Amino acid sequence: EITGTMRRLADQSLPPNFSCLENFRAYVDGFEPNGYIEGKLSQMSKEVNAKIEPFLKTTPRPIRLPDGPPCFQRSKFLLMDALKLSIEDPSHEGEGIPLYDAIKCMRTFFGWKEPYIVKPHEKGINPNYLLSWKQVLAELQDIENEEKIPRTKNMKKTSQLKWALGENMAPEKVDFDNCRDVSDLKQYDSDEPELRSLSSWIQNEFNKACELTDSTWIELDEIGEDVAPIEYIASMRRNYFTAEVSHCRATEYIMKGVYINTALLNASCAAMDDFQLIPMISKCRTKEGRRKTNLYGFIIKGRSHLRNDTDVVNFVSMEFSLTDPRLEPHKWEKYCVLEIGDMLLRSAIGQMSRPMFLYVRTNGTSKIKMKWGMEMRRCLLQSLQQIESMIEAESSVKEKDMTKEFFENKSETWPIGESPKGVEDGSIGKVCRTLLAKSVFNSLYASPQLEGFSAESRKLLLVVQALRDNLEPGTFDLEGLYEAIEECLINDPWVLLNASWFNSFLTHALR
Amino acid sequence: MDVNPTLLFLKVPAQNAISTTFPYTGDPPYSHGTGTGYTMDTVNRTHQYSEKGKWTTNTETGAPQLNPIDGPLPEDNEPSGYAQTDCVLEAMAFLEESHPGIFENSCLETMEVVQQTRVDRLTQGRQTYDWTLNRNQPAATALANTIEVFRSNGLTANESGRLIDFLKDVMESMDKEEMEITTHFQRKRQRTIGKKKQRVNKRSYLIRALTLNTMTKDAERGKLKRRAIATPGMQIRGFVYFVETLARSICEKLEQSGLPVGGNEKKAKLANVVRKMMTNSQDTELSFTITGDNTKWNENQNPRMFLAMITYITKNQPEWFRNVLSIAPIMFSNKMARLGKGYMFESKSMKLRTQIPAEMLASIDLKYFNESTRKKIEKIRPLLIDGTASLSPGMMMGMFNMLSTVLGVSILNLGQKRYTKTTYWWDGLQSSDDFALIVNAPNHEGIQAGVDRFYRTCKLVGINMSKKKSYINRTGTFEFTSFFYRYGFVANFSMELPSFGVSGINESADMSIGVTVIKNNMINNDLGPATAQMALQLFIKDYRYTYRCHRGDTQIQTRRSFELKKLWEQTRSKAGLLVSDGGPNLYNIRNLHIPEVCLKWELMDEDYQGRLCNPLNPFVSHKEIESVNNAVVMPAHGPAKSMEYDAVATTHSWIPKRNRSILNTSQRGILEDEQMYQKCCNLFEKFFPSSSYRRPVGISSMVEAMVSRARIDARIDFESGRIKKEEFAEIMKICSTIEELRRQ
Amino acid sequence: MERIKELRNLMSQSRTREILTKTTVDHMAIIKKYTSGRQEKNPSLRMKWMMAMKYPITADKRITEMVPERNEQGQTLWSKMSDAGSDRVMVSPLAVTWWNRNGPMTSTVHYPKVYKTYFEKVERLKHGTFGPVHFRNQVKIRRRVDINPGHADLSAKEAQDVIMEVVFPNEVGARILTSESQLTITKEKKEELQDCKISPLMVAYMLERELVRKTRFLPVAGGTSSVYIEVLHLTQGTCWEQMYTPGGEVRNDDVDQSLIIAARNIVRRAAVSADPLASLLEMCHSTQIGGTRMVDILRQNPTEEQAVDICKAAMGLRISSSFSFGGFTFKRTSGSSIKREEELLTGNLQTLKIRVHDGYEEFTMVGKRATAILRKATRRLVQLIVSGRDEQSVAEAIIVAMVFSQEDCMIKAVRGDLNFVNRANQRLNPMHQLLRHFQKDAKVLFQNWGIEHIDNVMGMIGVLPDMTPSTEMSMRGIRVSKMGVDEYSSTERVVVSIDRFLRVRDQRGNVLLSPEEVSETQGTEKLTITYSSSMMWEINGPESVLVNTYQWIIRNWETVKIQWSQNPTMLYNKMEFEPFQSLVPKAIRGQYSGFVRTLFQQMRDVLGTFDTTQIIKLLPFAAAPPKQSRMQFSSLTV
RNA sequence: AAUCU
RNA sequence: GCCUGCUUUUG
RNA sequence: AGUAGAAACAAGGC
């Protein structure tokens, strides 16, 4: 029984020409249709419409990109401009104390100088970065004279690293009844980000990520013994895949990031109050089968009391390089760049003596970003899956396996990039490396802009495909779709590059 | 040469490579602070698209409520919540006309369900907003606290154990002047933890019973900007359970729905429906497909239209049924909304920060805020009542999806060619906030006319179509809930990509889940065999690095690299060890469907085999059959589903530790209650072993049944068996003392 | 003895006493799920974060007297800190490996019997026989299939009480066990699991996985049985089949079902060929089912179905000219019959197409616990005599006969929700659905059938709606008799001849079977049928048939393009387009053929007209014998 | 030759 | 000095 | 400073 309060709420929960639930029930029970929808349509304005806008070849315009100062670099480690010192240590991926390997790989370099600054930061205090380098060197020295490498080096908490790691920068948390009459008390700044225009360096980074190399970067677990024929088929397929995939700079970045993010997460949970030195180490197997260890630089972790997934741990990155910072300074907005030495390469220029720089930075990361960079190997699947699909799509047609034909004979090709004189085609391995690098860059340059752009451009890609398939496509509001795509292009280099690629696709398609 | 992957789409079609367009190898977007702003935005939006209606003041809450039903007709293509009763009822009538007996039969099924079901059904589900605490708690905790306050006040019908009696109780609780509740605290100087009574006048109880909690949704794939979502309470839960039961029963009988079916059932139904349409269509007839989304779907849809629908579907049924299904749309027409955490303020000169709760936005000077937020608060301040905003004219995200699908199919059923009275016609497929329409006509003019009539017939009900996100092509290709149909459905594989790592349950469970997703993706998706071998290798690397279980013939120093070497050297047969104990991987495509213990059972040493698989281990915990080998996993583009994994109970089947933050909060005393209840229940399972397999039934106190069974088992085990006379006398003495403690 | 002391210790306290006394047993169910929170919203990250710290695992507190606080190297294995809402204590993952290298031992001989399903998979992969790999164009179709086939006797409501009696024999209550299979399973599992201490809960979970049935929608090619679905990731791909044959023993339902489907497909092709019998023999030799060849099953297995009978007779065997319906075994004894492909409505207004038969005909129904004799006409029952044992046996026979009669008195007696499609818009069979509807109770079919008078001949008994014999007036056509033993053992197989075109004939000369009596239905085998002649798709299904036909003509385009111009009659009468023609309806084959041949001929006549798509599209329709016509087509049905 | 979530 | 590192996340 | 991006972190609570 509905009675009392719940009757009243019932009477106030109906259309407006009713005052009682029971009269409404009676109206419903006596409802027979006598053409109401027709009348209400006849009354409604004819401006309410769904007019079909055709989609032709001359219809789609380019996506407009933002205007502003050029885009800078925002990764957690250097991609193309990085240098590695090596000693040829015969130990596998996770084996060996890393500080010892680091000291050993630093001993093998001769050419150190007194450090001085080449390119300052313009919003920081560069002597602190310099002094932090010097402190790193002092600590590497006093490690050797300790009689046992400890696997975990804490640093002294001094002014330089307190500044560079953001200590006592947060404001204090108080009660509102004790901060009412304050002048500048206001809301947190919540505004549209600063716009930033595309630059040329992101495409060169991507071109180098798609390249072959003279070393191996991934050693895979063993699996069982193959008992069925399809297991042997899969094994030869896998041999080809692994060959193409172990020789690629993208895999080098995978292993780098996995190492660093693993190390940072573990040190962050283990040592929350202490500062900690963490070398960047990698392991390769060069062309002659020799194992090599490789040092890319150093990281100093700060305090890591992370009560929340988005809370930030700050760190100071130091990386070696040979690349002059005076030729693309807009790329290095967030960096101080020192000069630390000289290096003699395999020289036809007498002996070379090319200088040697240290790129220094403050950066930061979160638990979820670490977690997702701790598992970048999934990228290897994505690429490879697509590749096998293509192979299988032909093996069904020609009733035979086609991995050998594709990988050896280079019969079939697919378009991969734009050169002067136009579209250029590549082999299945080039496609594999290109998609692998795409996934790696999605993981490294991940943003909400990429999510948005991917969805909103999926739609346009599909209507273009419907035009190429000759299916008479149409729209209702296309400028709304464009305004929705352009709403996400703000400041991320990777997203603007994808948009540039989409414009090139529309130019080469739609013909 | 400069590289462009998108040019690959110049040779391979977009659906056969759509996996490239899904950036699901990177971190997803997250929210960081309050969600008050998005709440305000949704409130003011749904009051904007329904503004030409009429305002009223409820006599019970005092709240200003906006009624747009049977309001004016739209004049432009902007969203509108001006629904018309006559057209909704005409839609339902023609639906029953085309599929007779649907409402009768569905009502009979739901009547059986209403009569049989129990209160325990509310324990299983998602979290629930507890008015007793003014925050979210699990479902069973909220149920228990609600029942406690009811019994403390006088409502005791739920002792019957049925749900409908609990609903009679929550209804009878609204006609009470002063409800009473109890609140937790704790004080330390000595940690004192206690309780205190307080009172709740009738209007306060009503606003608390009618309100919903709001929060921002993290880990959303596919959006630049964050969304707000709602969570309903305990009192609106049984009613909506019955309503969605009815809606399920109806939608099951409709060839257009997609909501009650999942996985391959969904795709099968979609494909069968498309084939049926293309067979019923003619050869001289032109055919087109709209791939469509609806804009502002959850703000336009009004509960009053749902009440109309309910009263038409319960036509010629018993009044108790008509009256127990009419309460959900009522209570969602007088609903409210908590705004949330609030905001935080910053001073640079003095170097300080502050927090501002949402329950002072009516009593705070607007100098602090910026323009957008100032406008928001300026618009919303009329609707504030005790820290919660009135929200009549629309739903919230994630509720009544079934009945909304029923309305969508009602509109799709108006294209049968006996209801259009013309030569064009239409049909399609509907899920909540997504649809595929198929329109047939002998020319393009009829196509445009059918599209126009669909748009207008849907605007007469409050269904607005997103022109910005919809497109029309010929039949053969379309998109539906991230399923890309191209003359047949197509595999994507990037939706399933975050399911290829360590799941984070335990060693055995993570292992089994890891191999099981590989073989599933081999079946359902198009993961090849070589790529599956690689997936094995990579999964085993992640497994070993996470759980610190390396081969044992390695030199990788971890915190348990010493125990594993000792185990390695003791062991003779090393192919019989588990990857979690420092052993090899014998998995391949041939044998992905077998657990890790049966795979290697003849290779084990007997001592290891008996240590590992031992029931006396202190690490294992099995509680109830519905939680034995079943784990919650969190996909991309979906809710947290439950996965079944085949495994053997070993010493690796451990549970991990708890959050432990609640120690520092006023609500610390929930731990002690939990602990005591668990003591009592454990002892009950000692006496009654079946209590974890089959639900007990009884009215006696637990101690009574316990001591009774003790006496019975004592007698039967002394008569012919183990128990001697001394034990008999002693335990009977203990039973006697238990009686002297309980009865006095 | 020790648990009653714990009860005393609880009752001594004040809060716990208040919980024990003022808490009913139906409320225990709610408070046992009471907690502060047990939900991780990202468990992966929590594991990564927690396994980086010390003591992330929990265990019972008695570990303190089973494992030491630290090992010889000095690493601590457990802590003194307790979990939040528990008595459990925090420990490390080192206590686990310590237990596994130095912990107590047990006997693990019971374990392969509790976890029987898993070790059965093991033994069934061990004794399996692999075969070659074939690359081809594969079409998968989505279907409901069994993961666990369960015990066929228990119905999934008896199984739970069986589980209760085995594991929890004193907490079962009033339920006695009735069927003999229940007692058999109970004593078997009860003497096996006598004094085990694994856990009752896990034993029950595994017995459920043994006994109850479990289904799933998946995309399937090849075999549908459960032994073939656990290995579908290995046998079937997107481009490749892997021959495989599991090692255990196979149920015979699967075998006879798969033989029936194989024989149906074989006969369907063979009928449209030039010499059906030769083709039929070659197909039966070159095919095998579940590894075992087809001739072996055909010689060993007695199965009642028309296509199997044609196959057997072609092998020169004795046939049982018979079939099955509703569990009863029908043998015609008079009259001819033809199907009609008609449409009608129900009492619940659902529309349906069925195949109604022609002619007056008599039949000899047989069963397990009944027997009957039936006479009927087109859509109309003529007479029915019955010889059942119990009254409900006669009820079963009568409802089966009524459904078999196809009378409108039965069609217009359907009331309720009877959906003639699946939950995925899949067309079930109408007859089976009606027969399932009238098996709850056929009260309306009895109260709506009719009444007649009787001659009181033989002293035969009258019919019963609800056990009420009526010895002078009764239902029309329906009588009853009584027998203590079998009337006649009609399992007596006869010898036959066969024409080229598969017309079976008895010793006299009359006709008994024909390729028109085989079903027009398209099923999906339970065991994987393997065909090795040259092309492995000619009995696989219509979708595969279409894809592989068009793919073949694509690959051989270089010589078809020139054979199409010179000597084209030798291209239409080709052995590759015969599986296709089985899908074209028999009425519109020659019309399509004449249409298409005239198309191609006048496409050759005028110069400057050539479209390879048209030729590749319309050739499988020109295979058939040509019937001339005057009309035109906008499409072509398959 | 099938109708069980 | 003590305590904490998801106590509120639609379908 | 830096992370980030419509609101937060740059440790928090008593």
Curated annotation (Swiss-Prot), chain A:
Major enzyme class: hydrolase
Keywords from the UniProt entry: Cap snatching, Endonuclease, Eukaryotic host gene expression shutoff by virus, Eukaryotic host transcription shutoff by virus, Host cytoplasm, Host gene expression shutoff by virus, Host nucleus, Host-virus interaction, Hydrolase, Inhibition of host RNA polymerase II by virus, Manganese, Metal-binding, Nuclease, Phosphoprotein
Example GO molecular function: metal ion binding
Subcellular localization: Host cytoplasm; Host nucleus
Obligatory cofactor(s): Mn(2+)
Motif (Nuclear localization signal 2 (NLS2)): 1-42
Gene Ontology cellular-component terms listed: host cell cytoplasm; host cell nucleus
UniProt modification remark: Phosphorylated on serines and threonines by host kinases, including human casein kinase II.
Keyword Protein biosynthesis: no
EC numbers for this chain: 3.1.-.-
Co-factor remark: Binds 2 manganese ions per subunit.
Keyword set includes ATP-binding: no
GO biological process: cap snatching; DNA-templated transcription; symbiont-mediated suppression of host gene expression; symbiont-mediated suppression of host mRNA transcription via inhibition of RNA polymerase II activity; viral RNA genome replication; viral translational frameshifting
Quaternary state and interactors: Influenza RNA polymerase is composed of three subunits: PB1, PB2 and PA. Interacts (via C-terminus) with PB1 (via N-terminus).
Assigned protein family: Belongs to the influenza viruses PA family.
Its job: Plays an essential role in viral RNA transcription and replication by forming the heterotrimeric polymerase complex together with PB1 and PB2 subunits. The complex transcribes viral mRNAs by using a unique mechanism called cap-snatching. It consists in the hijacking and cleavage of host capped pre-mRNAs. These short capped RNAs are then used as primers for viral mRNAs. The PB2 subunit is responsible for the binding of the 5' cap of cellular pre-mRNAs which are subsequently cleaved after 10-13 nucleotides by the PA subunit that carries the endonuclease activity.
Protein name: Polymerase acidic protein
UniProtKB/Swiss-Prot annotation, chain B:
Residues annotated as domain RdRp catalytic: 274-471
Region annotation Disordered: where it falls in the sequence: 50-82
One Pfam assignment: Flu_PB1
GO cellular component: host cell cytoplasm; host cell nucleus
Domain of life: Viruses
Broad class of where this protein is predominantly found: host cell
Protein purpose: RNA-dependent RNA polymerase which is responsible for replication and transcription of virus RNA segments. The transcription of viral mRNAs occurs by a unique mechanism called cap-snatching. 5' methylated caps of cellular mRNAs are cleaved after 10-13 nucleotides by PA. In turn, these short capped RNAs are used as primers by PB1 for transcription of viral mRNAs. During virus replication, PB1 initiates RNA synthesis and copy vRNA into complementary RNA (cRNA) which in turn serves as a template for the production of more vRNAs.
Subunit structure: Influenza RNA polymerase is composed of three subunits: PB1, PB2 and PA. Interacts (via N-terminus) with PA (via C-terminus). Interacts (via C-terminus) with PB2 (via N-terminus); this interaction is essential for transcription initiation.
Protein name: RNA-directed RNA polymerase catalytic subunit
Organism this protein belongs to: Influenza A virus (strain A/Northern Territory/60/1968 H3N2) (Influenza A virus (strain NT60))
Gene name for this UniProt entry: PB1
From Swiss-Prot, chain C:
Record's keyword terms, sorted: Cap snatching, Eukaryotic host gene expression shutoff by virus, Eukaryotic host transcription shutoff by virus, Host gene expression shutoff by virus, Host mitochondrion, Host nucleus, Host-virus interaction, Inhibition of host innate immune response by virus, Inhibition of host MAVS by virus, Inhibition of host RLR pathway by virus, Inhibition of host RNA polymerase II by virus, mRNA capping, mRNA processing, Viral immunoevasion, Viral transcription, Virion
A biological process from GO: symbiont-mediated suppression of host mRNA transcription via inhibition of RNA polymerase II activity
Chain coiled-coil ranges: none
Subcellular location: Virion; Host nucleus; Host mitochondrion
Molecular functions per Gene Ontology: RNA binding; RNA-directed RNA polymerase activity
Biological role stated in the UniProt entry: Plays an essential role in transcription initiation and cap-stealing mechanism, in which cellular capped pre-mRNAs are used to generate primers for viral transcription. Recognizes and binds the 7-methylguanosine-containing cap of the target pre-RNA which is subsequently cleaved after 10-13 nucleotides by the viral protein PA. Plays a role in the initiation of the viral genome replication and modulates the activity of the ribonucleoprotein (RNP) complex.
Biological classification of the source: Viruses, Riboviria, Orthornavirae, Negarnaviricota, Polyploviricotina
Residues of the full protein shown: 1 to 638 of 759
Name of the molecule in the record: Polymerase basic protein 2
Quaternary organization: Influenza RNA polymerase is composed of three subunits: PB1, PB2 and PA. Interacts (via N-terminus) with PB1 (via C-terminus). Interacts with nucleoprotein NP (via N-terminus). Interacts (via N-terminus) with host MAVS (via N-terminus); this interaction inhibits host innate immune response.
Family according to the record: Belongs to the influenza viruses PB2 family.
Cellular component, GO, one term: host cell nucleus
Site (Mammalian adaptation): K627
